[PDB]
Design an enzyme around this catalytic site. Structure first.
Site, PDB file in Angstrom:
ATOM      1  N   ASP A  26       6.427  16.328   9.342  1.00  0.00           N
ATOM      2  CA  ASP A  26       6.050  15.938   7.976  1.00  0.00           C
ATOM      3  C   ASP A  26       4.552  15.768   7.657  1.00  0.00           C
ATOM      4  OD1 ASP A  26       6.981  15.701   5.363  1.00  0.00           O
ATOM      5  OD2 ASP A  26       7.087  13.504   5.510  1.00  0.00           O
ATOM      6  N   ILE A  52       0.761  -1.252   0.000  1.00  0.00           N
ATOM      7  CA  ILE A  52       0.000   0.000   0.000  1.00  0.00           C
ATOM      8  C   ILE A  52       0.792   1.303   0.000  1.00  0.00           C
ATOM      9  CG2 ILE A  52      -2.167  -1.009   0.852  1.00  0.00           C
ATOM     10  CD1 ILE A  52      -1.600  -0.262   3.525  1.00  0.00           C
ATOM     11  N   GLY A  88       9.806   2.507   5.525  1.00  0.00           N
ATOM     12  CA  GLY A  88       9.120   1.220   5.468  1.00  0.00           C
ATOM     13  C   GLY A  88       8.009   1.096   4.458  1.00  0.00           C
ATOM     14  N   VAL A 107       4.541  -1.115   5.309  1.00  0.00           N
ATOM     15  CA  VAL A 107       3.292  -0.550   4.757  1.00  0.00           C
ATOM     16  C   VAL A 107       2.571  -1.405   3.741  1.00  0.00           C
ATOM     17  CG1 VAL A 107       1.874   1.452   4.896  1.00  0.00           C
ATOM     18  CG2 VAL A 107       4.297   1.669   5.356  1.00  0.00           C
TER      19      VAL A 107
END
Lengths: 356, 10
Positions: free
Chosen positions: A145, A26, A32, A34
């Protein structure tokens, strides 16, 4: 009979508890993939984030810790919730990668920026985002972020902030780690940061939703600053004074701009029909935008102020906005450097703690 | 001035 099992996703191995099946790629965190999965036990979709030998390096180790540590002690309906952590490795000695399970939302903001929202919907989404944020701040942590890719929603109109590897406390002590467009001036012109550095991010996000496109593109870290001053106009001499002289020259050297007004930046045209009652005004939004998208870090509105603002506060609920802060185990103060051995040590205990 | 409860992610 082993408790884990492995599956190839491209040329990535996911070794996860049997409970979790039907994996599907995804996305990426700071670090990473995910990966979406059926937790067969819990009978519900989850996201499994793999961090591959995260201690492999100073940077990584550090981010990984925070990620884990924050993911743990943070609890708020607008922060993405933790579900399980593990490593398939059987010892501290033998250890190498970590897996994090979080809830799976329906989509990230990408996405929403795409369709034309109505005021109540937009306003409310912001409201959520902000509470989520104010949560983090309420314990001193900055996200650094925030960006649509890092913000996910559900189709009941709920919203959660996501991915904490980036997240720390204020200051200075790389510039180019936060997503280029969502970079506050402080970050662009390398002057360190405080809380409302996020507020800037929120302006860019809110703006982007309203504009349908990225507020300030900018092709390189340098061109970025053109896109900012282009639109908002050249900051005050007063502000410049605070710049590292080397930067300060280049900046002062840029062509001067008065910059457009927020009415002109953000024509009525763009906004939907105006409120049911007063406060959800196309111009009320602008006024918020005008207080968020402010080059001067110390002339810039905070979450609290933004939660007070008449385009947000219609949803205000103290039980969400003034929630109890998260407790961070105090021994951790997000910067003390270590050896790759001390780090691997730290994470592993931290995973071990968190395993069931 | 009610909260919405639905978000079309069609």
């Amino acid at each position: 009979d082993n408790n884990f099992y492995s599956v190839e996703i491209g040329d990535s191995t996911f070794t996860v508890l049997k409970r979790y099946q039907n994996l599907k790629p995804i996305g990426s965190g700071a670090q990473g993939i995910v990966c979406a999965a059926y937790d067969a036990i819990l009978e519900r979709n989850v996201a499994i984030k793999k961090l591959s030998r995260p201690f492999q390096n100073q940077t990584h180790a550090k981010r990984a810790y925070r990620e884990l540590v924050l993911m743990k002690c943070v609890n708020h309906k607008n922060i993405i919730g933790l579900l399980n952590v593990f490593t398939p490795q059987k010892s501290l000695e033998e250890f190498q990668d970590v897996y994090i399970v979080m809830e799976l939302m329906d989509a990230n903001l990408s996405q929403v920026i795409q369709m034309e929202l109505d005021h109540e919907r937009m306003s409310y989404l912001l409201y959520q985002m902000l509470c989520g944020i104010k949560h983090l701040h309420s314990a001193g942590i900055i996200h650094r972020d925030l960006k649509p890719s890092n913000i996910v929603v559900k189709s009941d109109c709920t919203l959660k902030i996501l991915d904490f590897g980036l997240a720390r406390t204020a200051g200075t002590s790389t510039p180019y780690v936060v997503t280029r467009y969502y970079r506050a001036p402080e970050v662009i012109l390398g002057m360190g940061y405080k809380e409302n550095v996020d507020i800037w991010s929120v302006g860019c996000i809110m703006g982007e939703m309203i504009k349908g496109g990225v507020l300030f593109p900018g092709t390189d870290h340098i061109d970025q600053w053109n896109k900012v001053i282009e639109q908002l106009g050249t900051p005050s001499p007063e502000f410049m004074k605070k710049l590292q002289p080397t930067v300060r020259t280049y900046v002062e050297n840029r062509p001067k701009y008065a910059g457009y007004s927020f009415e002109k930046l953000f024509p009525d045209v763009l906004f939907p029909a105006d409120s049911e009652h007063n406060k959800l005004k196309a111009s009320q939004a602008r006024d918020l935008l005008s207080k968020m998208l402010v080059i001067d870090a110390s002339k810039r509105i905070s979450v609290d102020e933004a939660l007070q603002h008449p385009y947000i506060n219609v949803w205000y609920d103290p039980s969400e906005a003034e929630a109890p802060p998260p407790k961070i185990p105090d021994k951790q103060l997000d910067e003390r450097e270590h050896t790759i051995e001390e780090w691997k040590e730290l994470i592993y205990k931290e995973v071990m703690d968190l395993e069931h | 001035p009610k909260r919405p409860t639905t978000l079309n992610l069609f």
